[PDB]
Amino acid sequence: KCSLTGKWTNDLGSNMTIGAVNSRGEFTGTYTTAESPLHGTENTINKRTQPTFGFTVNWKFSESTTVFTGQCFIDRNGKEVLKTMWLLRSSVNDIGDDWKATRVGINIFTRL
Amino acid sequence: CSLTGKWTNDLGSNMTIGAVNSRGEFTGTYTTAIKESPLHGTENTINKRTQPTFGFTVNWKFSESTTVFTGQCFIDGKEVLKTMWLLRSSVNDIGDDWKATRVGINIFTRL
Amino acid sequence: KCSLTGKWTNDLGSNMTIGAVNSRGEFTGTYTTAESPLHGTENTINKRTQPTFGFTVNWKFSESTTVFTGQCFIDRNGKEVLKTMWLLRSSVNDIGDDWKATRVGINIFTRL
Amino acid sequence: CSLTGKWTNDLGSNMTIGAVNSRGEFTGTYTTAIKESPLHGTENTINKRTQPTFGFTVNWKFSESTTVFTGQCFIDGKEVLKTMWLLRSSVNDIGDDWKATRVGINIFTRL
Ligand SMILES: O=C(O)CCCCC[C@@H]1SC[C@@H]2NC(=O)N[C@@H]21
Ligand SMILES: O=C(O)CCCCC[C@@H]1SC[C@@H]2NC(=O)N[C@@H]21
Ligand SMILES: O=C(O)CCCCC[C@@H]1SC[C@@H]2NC(=O)N[C@@H]21
Ligand SMILES: O=C(O)CCCCC[C@@H]1SC[C@@H]2NC(=O)N[C@@H]21
Ligand SMILES: *[C@H]1O[C@H](CO)[C@@H](O)[C@H](O)[C@H]1NC(C)=O
Ligand SMILES: *[C@H]1O[C@H](CO)[C@@H](O)[C@H](O)[C@H]1NC(C)=O
Ligand SMILES: *[C@H]1O[C@H](CO)[C@@H](O)[C@H](O)[C@H]1NC(C)=O
Ligand SMILES: *[C@H]1O[C@H](CO)[C@@H](O)[C@H](O)[C@H]1NC(C)=O
Structure with a gap:
């Protein structure tokens, strides 16, 4: 079974720690990158070995927000x-600059 | 501009969001024709902004999928x-991962 | 049948003109927003009434690039x-700032 | 950094791109296990940049789908x-449009 709980690191150099996940599939943790809290959920439905999930990172050094989603x-190895x-949402002042507030990207994590 | 309340959208889905603590957290329900799913998000409180940026995850109850939403009020x-x-589908093998993510828009208005 | 050929306008105020599309499904045109050329293709496969397509907009006022894709x-009306x-790709100097060069969005067009 | 040549990727697809005129246009073939599809793109020549931004459309031959790629050399x-x-699927009714677009990444290297 693939568990979210633990310490991860990615291709960009950023690290991430996730706490235990309750029965509601909920969990919290911390995102470290060269610290901000994150809160997410894991899909419990058919209680699978390779869960789908999603979490939000409330940036504490700017007024932007990032949301990640993926699968555990x-x-093969x-x-x-x-x-x-x-998706990284930056904040804009007028509802007219909205068309450019969203960036998209990827991130691969492996255990620390 | 606060997330608390009742919203609906262009596709025709309703969403209910409760109060948000001093840390920006909040919970809610997501309705779409119908099936109700829990929602867990957070709003950026960095500058006590009147038009806060935010994000949340909808944990589907009728599928093994997940959907994340980000945006601004x-x-x-x-x-x-x-x-x-971003709508993540669950695939059996890491080989198909490439085709597992859909992206799209959504404008919500006060129901 | 839904044809690409013609003059369109969108929700953002930008206008677009598309020329005839040959048998290879190819076509060119112009994108106007408050002028840059665009070159695209339309999917011919099962010669459908509501074609899928994609085009690139070679910005002539900056070194960025935008690609649109959608269906005609x-x-109901x-x-x-x-x-x-x-997807709007902006150019960056170091292959390390690459993680933030891509923005994503939508655009709805209707005939002029 | 010029697009002309032979490239392959992480998924294991090959791409061949021909010469690009003074306007930045170019054509090529897209191979994926196998089926070959034509590709038509353009590269930004705004600043005679050595690391040009670019985009292109792959007109699938075994489907009614379209895929657009953007990026930088x-x-x-x-x-x-x-x-x-962005991988656009073709849906029969404008009602399903919302679920018709997949997004993803791809790193190409000189074959
Ligand atoms: O500089 C900005 O544009 C705003 C700061 C955004 C915070 C870092 C982002 S979150 C998505 C991405 N993944 C990662 O590990 N670092 C970046
Ligand atoms: O039927 C499926 O494709 C799987 C279930 C997907 C859940 C509904 C999706 S989430 C993004 C989109 N926005 C919205 O309000 N409803 C749809
Ligand atoms: O300011 C920038 O970030 C670079 C300029 C980009 C050109 C305008 C973009 S292309 C996608 C979007 N659709 C549209 O109609 N206008 C915008
Ligand atoms: O099988 C399908 O889902 C429809 C055909 C899709 C065509 C292949 C897609 S395009 C994006 C992705 N990158 C790549 O190199 N191959 C896939
Ligand atoms: C995170 O991962 C470990 C924890 O110390 C270490 O190898 C690395 O330096 C850390 N990097 C960051 C950006 O936190
Ligand atoms: C929810 O929105 C309103 C509630 O006032 C209702 O009329 C509508 O039918 C509902 N839609 C769904 C998908 O539940
Ligand atoms: C484009 O559409 C028509 C053409 O004149 C007109 O209504 C509008 O002013 C034009 N706008 C732009 C940005 O070209
Ligand atoms: C194309 O790339 C190389 C060509 O040298 C070949 O070995 C490989 O099998 C080919 N892959 C596909 C999908 O055609």
Whole structure:
């Protein structure tokens, strides 16, 4: 089974720690990048080995917000890997600059 | 512009969001024809901004999928929520991962 | 049948003109926003009434690039409408700032 | 960093791009296991940049779908192409449009 709980690191150099996840599939943690809290959920439905999930990172050094979503996989080499895609929403003043507030990208995590 | 309350959108889905603590957290329900799913998000409180940026995850109850929403609460007069989302599907093997993510838009208005 | 050929306008105020599309599904045109050329393709496969397509806009006022993709629909009210999503790639100097060069958005077009 | 040549990627697809005129246009073939599809793109020539931004459309031959790619040619030493794409599926009714677009990444390297 692929568990979210733990310490992860990615291709960009950022690290992430996730706490235990309750029965409601909920969980919290911290996102570290060269610290901000994050709160997410894991899909419990058919209680699968490779869960789908999503979390929000409330940036504490700016008024932007990032949301990641992806799946917890057991790689071919037998290792746990998190494939995720995110949307980074920056804040704009007029509802007219809104068309450019959203960036999109990816991030692959592996256990620390 | 506060997230608390009742919203609906262009597709025709309703969303209910409760109070948000001093840390910006909040919970709510997501309704779409119908099935209700829990929602857990957070709003950026960095600058006590009147048009706060925010994000939340909808944990689907009728599927093994997940959907994340990010956006900003704009005072159009009326309060409008402009969002963009990512819909992650669950695939059996890491080989198909590439085709598992849909992206799209959604404008919410006070129900 | 929903044709790409013609003059369109969108929700953002930008206008667009598309030329005839050959048998290879190819076509060119111009994108006007408050002028840059664009070159695209339309999917011919099962020669459908509501084609799928994609085009690139070679910005002539900056070194960024935008690509749109979507489908040509016959709306319920009987009108032609183009639902599209785009990616706007801005250019960065170091392959390390790459994680933030891509923005994503939407654009709905209707005939002028 | 020029697009002309032969590239392959992480998924394992090959792409061949021909010469690009003075306007930045170019054509090529897209191979994926196998089926070959034509590609038509353009590269930004605004600043005679050595690491040009670019975009192109792949007109699928075995489906009614379309895929657009945008990105930048980076000199990693080696020439690398970092791209992001949108895969549009064709739906019968404008009602399902919302679920018709997939997004993803792709890193190309000189084959
Ligand atoms: O500089 C900005 O544009 C705003 C700061 C955004 C915070 C870092 C972002 S979140 C998505 C991405 N993944 C990651 O690990 N770092 C970046
Ligand atoms: O039917 C499926 O494709 C799987 C269930 C998907 C859940 C509904 C999606 S989430 C993004 C989109 N916005 C919205 O309000 N409803 C749809
Ligand atoms: O200011 C920038 O960030 C670079 C200029 C980008 C050009 C305008 C973009 S293309 C996608 C979007 N659709 C539209 O009609 N106008 C915008
Ligand atoms: O099988 C399908 O889902 C429809 C055909 C899709 C065409 C292949 C897609 S395009 C984006 C992605 N990158 C890549 O190199 N191959 C895939
Ligand atoms: C995070 O991962 C470990 C924890 O110390 C370490 O290898 C690395 O320096 C850390 N990097 C960041 C950006 O926190
Ligand atoms: C929810 O929104 C309103 C509630 O006032 C209702 O009329 C509508 O039918 C509902 N839609 C869904 C999908 O539940
Ligand atoms: C484009 O559409 C028509 C053409 O004149 C007109 O209504 C409008 O002013 C034009 N706007 C732009 C930005 O070109
Ligand atoms: C294309 O790339 C190389 C060509 O040298 C070949 O070995 C590989 O099998 C080919 N892959 C596909 C999908 O055609």
